[PDB]
Design a binder for this molecule. Structure first.
Ligand SMILES: [Cl-]
Ligand SMILES: [Mg+2]
Ligand SMILES: [Zn+2]
Ligand SMILES: [Zn+2]
Length: 188
């Protein structure tokens, strides 16, 4: 097991709008359990993953990070009588069908409260916004990553070799613009 490579982190979680080539989606997750009215981190549950490449046979897209995330949750063997808060830090927001699947998951697993904190919004000008609205309606808390979340991911998920988090240019500007955009999506 290895932590995330720093250049991988930086390349993927960079929130600058005017670059291209971030085809992947990285997803960092943490789990908390409610213990006497206090959320308590379960640190064995921490991890990260990314979207998969398509199989050489063709026709099918590579499995999206969000589905793989949903794939592993049952193996956590969470106690259905207990309460958990599951937080994902994602480089991109979910596509519509991933949002739909995530909405179905949280619908059927009331022991989980899902929080999605995303570096960037992927809006395909199609159903993406519907998906975010639908996921929020099902009870997911969707928000935009700020300095605080980026630093946390760096400290927690990245192989940093003691180096502190160094914000890239415009991190706060972009984050503020995205928060506004997300507010407009979720009230729209
Ligand atoms: Cl991109
Ligand atoms: Mg900029
Ligand atoms: Zn296959
Ligand atoms: Zn997807």
């Amino acid at each position: 097991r290895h932590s995330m490579d720093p250049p991988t982190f930086t390349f993927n979680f960079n929130n600058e709008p005017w670059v291209r080539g971030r085809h992947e989606t990285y997803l960092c997750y943490e789990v908390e359990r409610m213990h006497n009215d206090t959320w308590v981190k379960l640190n064995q549950r921490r991890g990260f993953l990314a979207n998969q490449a398509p199989h050489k046979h063709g026709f099918l897209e590579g499995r999206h990070a969000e589905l793989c995330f949903l794939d592993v949750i049952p193996f956590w063997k969470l106690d259905l009588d207990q309460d958990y808060r599951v937080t994902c830090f994602t480089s991109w927001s979910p596509c519509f069908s991933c949002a739909q699947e995530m909405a179905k998951f949280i619908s059927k697993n009331k022991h989980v409260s899902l929080c999605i904190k995303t570096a960037r919004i992927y809006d395909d000008q199609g159903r993406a916004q519907e998906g975010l609205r639908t996921l929020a309606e099902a009870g997911a808390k969707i928000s935009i990553m700020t300095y605080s979340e980026f630093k946390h991911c760096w400290d927690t998920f990245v192989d940093h070799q003691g180096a502190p988090f160094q914000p890239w240019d415009g991190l706060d500007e972009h984050s503020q613009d995205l928060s506004g955009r997300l507010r407009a999506i979720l009230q729209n």
